[PDB]
Amino acid sequence: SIAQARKLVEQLKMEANIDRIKVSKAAADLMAYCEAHAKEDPLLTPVPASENPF
């Protein structure tokens, strides 16, 4: 019991004590990463259909 509780506690501490961020920052970065590679995405950017891969 005291042992399991402790085991739980240290895990909750692990989940608890971390460098969180706000959603607007986190979200911006996603838009960022995406908009940054939007052209390199062959499924977004219909690569010159001639004979490339398929």
Binding site: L12, V23, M31, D41
Partner: protein, 339 residues
Amino acid sequence: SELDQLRQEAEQLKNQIRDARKACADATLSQITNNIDPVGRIQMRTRRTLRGHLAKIYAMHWGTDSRLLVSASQDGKLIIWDSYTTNKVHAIPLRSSWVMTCAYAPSGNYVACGGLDNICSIYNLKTREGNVRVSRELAGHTGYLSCCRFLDDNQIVTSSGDTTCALWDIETGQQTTTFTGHTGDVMSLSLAPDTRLFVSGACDASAKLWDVREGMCRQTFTGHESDINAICFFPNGNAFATGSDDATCRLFDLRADQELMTYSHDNIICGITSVSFSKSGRLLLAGYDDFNCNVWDALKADRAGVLAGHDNRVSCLGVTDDGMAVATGSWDSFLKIWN
């Protein structure tokens, strides 16, 4: 008494996590994205059809060369294909046909699979003596193997219906680390871009971030009203998508430690079996029970399109490392390469 300290300490901890998340909820992904040029609706067509399996295909994994791929079917064979020519580079006779997953190694030397046997079987493609026979069988799991991914020829992580994930040392066959925590079948797992940590989806409707080297669960993501069958990391490694029985797909941010978006549409209440990201992270591809693969805008949350070409459900998905193509496996026994 002493148990109260711990109990009381436990209670407060959950709330700080609760309140901590709450506090960061200063905006929504949708809000900040509401002002973006929509993906529009892009059309994809089947460029290649891979026939050779008899039974339902349960998984497939693209080789890092974005050309050769493995597919596992319960017809007892792992077929390794030449996505370009459609030639079968291989067909591995499985010691057990109740295969639920297969994994193509980053190096291209090995491949793996396992299932109702609770074993992860490591097949060396380079058997100079000729062809393939099981090189390693990783036993330890007491529930089906739901997913497996090599970090490299030397190590592979596995998820299981026994509620755990595990890291193994192929060379020796010993279970390196057991990732306990989930209280339901772990159905899927995804390796972060660097193979430093990974996330796992489970039947307790929760995802979990695990530190491979620490063998501990960092964070735990909830939000799904049902099992999680598929899981995938956003290309940058700071977010991941989950596919669930509850008819929805969800993006969760690691740094903001919480769900950011939900991808769903009325007139779609069947489960998702697989999720994959487009090379840029813009599109989220989810394989559905209704034979279709739905493509969503990972930022706006709308359906960019839908890949229809399978007669039974889409069981596994896969977008090449170079983002050049998508593979969709199915219970109908065919695989399709979409572009």
